[PDB]
C-alpha cells in the first residue's frame, strides 16, 4: 500500500482467529469495524518528519501470519527554504521548565489508550469557516525538514465560537506555551482532537462533551500571526492531516 507522510490509514483485517498486530515489537491496538462484523480496524500513521521509507506490519493469527507492506509517499505539501539554519535557541529556564513540563503532561495523555469509542458518528468541522493555513506547510534547510504545521488553521476573528468536532472526554483545558489556550479531547482508540489559541475555554478537564457542543471561543493566544483556530488530530500516536483523517474516519463511522 502507499501512505503519504503525516497521514493516517485505517487498516481492515479479518477478525476470526486474530491475535495481534505489530510494527516490529510495538503493538498496535484494534477495534470493531462497525458495519462489517467479520472485520476489525487499526489506525496506522506515518510521521511527517523523518518517516521510514517503508513499513512492514504483521497481523498474527492462530493459524497464520499476514504481512502488510506500506510504502511511504511524500505527497504535495507546500514547502519553503529556510534562510537561517534553525539551530538551538536559548530560552530562559523559566520557559524551558514550562515547555518540558507541558510536554510530559501531553505525552502522558497521548499514551493513555482508551479502548472504546467515546465518539458519536462522524466528525464535523469545529466551525463553518475556511482554511487559512494548510496542514503540512513545511520549512526546510538542505531539503531536511526542520518544522511543519502540525494542524490546520481556520479563519476566525477573535471570539468566533468553537464546537467539539465529535463526542469525547476533555483531557486538557488550559493555557499552554506553544498552544495558547488549548483544548484536547479523547475520542477513544487513541484519537485526540485539538483546538488551540482560543480566547476563551468553556470546559473543564474530565468533562464528557457532545459533538457540536460549545468548547470555547477562537482567539490568538500563544499565536504570533493573529486571530485564528488551529485544529489538530492525533491518531495512531502521531499528529496527522485532520481533514484527510476526518474524511477517512467518517467514511467508516457515519451515524
Sheet containing 18-23: order of strands: 2-4, 65-73, 54-61, 18-23, 26-27
Q: How far is CA 182 from the centre of its chain?
A: 14
Q: Cell numbers at residue 172, please?
A: 486538557
**What residues from 20 to 79 belong to the interface with ligand HY6 (CB under 6 A)?**
none
Decide whether 68 or 118 has the Cβ nearer to ligand HY6. Answer: 118
For the chain, the first-to-last Cα distance in angstroms comes to: 28
Residue 194 touches which of ligand HY6, Zn ion, none (CB < 5 to 8 A by kind)? Answer: ligand HY6
Report strand pairing: 54-61 vs 65-73: antiparallel
C-beta of 201: minimal distance to ligand HY6 in Å?
14
What number of H helices and E strands is found in the chain? 2, 21
Of 44-52, 62-70, 74-82, 229-237, the segment contacting Zn ion by CB under 5 A is: 229-237
Q: Cell numbers at residue 17, please?
A: 482467529
Q: Residues 168-207: x/- map of binding to ligand HY6 (CB under 6 A)? A: ----------xx----x---------x-------------
The answer to whether residue 176 forms part of the interface with Zn ion (CB under 5 A) is no
Query: Cα(248)–Cα(103) distance, rounded to whole angstroms?
Result: 28
Q: Residues 84-123: x/- map of binding to ligand HY6 (CB under 6 A)? A: ----------------------x-----------------
Name the site residues for ligand HY6 (rule: CB under 6 A): 106, 149-150, 153, 178-179, 184, 194, 223, 228, 230
Instruction: Please report, as ranges, the residues that interact with Zn ion according to CB under 5 A.
Output: 153, 230
Amino acid at each position: 500500500m502507499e501512505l503519504i507522510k503525516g497521514q493516517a490509514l485505517f487498516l481492515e483485517l479479518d477478525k476470526k482467529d486474530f491475535l495481534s498486530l505489530k510494527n516490529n515489537d510495538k503493538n498496535i491496538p484494534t477495534f470493531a469495524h462497525p458495519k462489517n462484523q467479520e472485520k476489525i480496524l487499526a489506525i496506522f500513521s506515518l510521521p511527517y518528519k523523518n518517516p521510514p521509507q517503508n513499513t512492514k506490519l504483521i497481523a498474527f493469527y492462530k493459524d497464520k501470519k499476514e504481512e502488510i507492506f506500506i510504502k511511504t509517499l511524500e505527497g504535495n505539501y507546500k514547502s519553503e527554504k529556510l534562510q537561517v539554519e534553525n539551530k538551538k535557541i536559548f530560552p530562559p529556564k523559566t520557559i524551558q521548565e514550562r515547555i518540558a513540563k507541558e510536554l510530559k503532561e501531553a505525552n502522558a495523555i497521548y499514551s493513555s489508550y482508551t479502548p472504546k469509542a467515546l465518539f458519536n458518528g462522524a466528525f464535523n468541522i469545529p466551525l463553518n469557516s475556511f482554511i487559512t493555513s494548510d496542514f503540512g506547510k513545511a520549512r526546510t534547510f538542505n531539503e531536511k525538514v526542520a518544522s511543519y504545521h502540525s494542524g490546520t488553521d481556520f479563519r476566525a476573528a477573535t471570539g468566533t465560537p468553537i464546537y467539539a468536532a465529535n463526542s469525547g472526554v476533555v483531557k486538557i483545558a488550559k493555557d499552554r506555551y506553544f498552544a495558547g489556550n488549548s483544548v484536547v479531547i479523547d475520542h477513544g482508540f487513541g484519537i485526540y482532537s485539538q483546538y488551540y489559541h482560543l480566547s476563551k475555554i468553556d470546559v473543564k478537564v474530565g468533562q464528557k462533551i457532545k459533538k457540536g457542543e460549545l468548547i470555547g471561543l477562537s482567539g490568538a493566544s500563544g499565536r504570533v500571526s493573529g486571530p485564528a483556530l488551529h485544529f489538530g488530530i492525533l491518531a495512531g500516536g502521531k499528529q496527522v492531516d485532520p481533514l484527510d483523517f476526518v474524511s477517512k474516519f467518517n467514511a467508516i463511522f457515519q451515524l
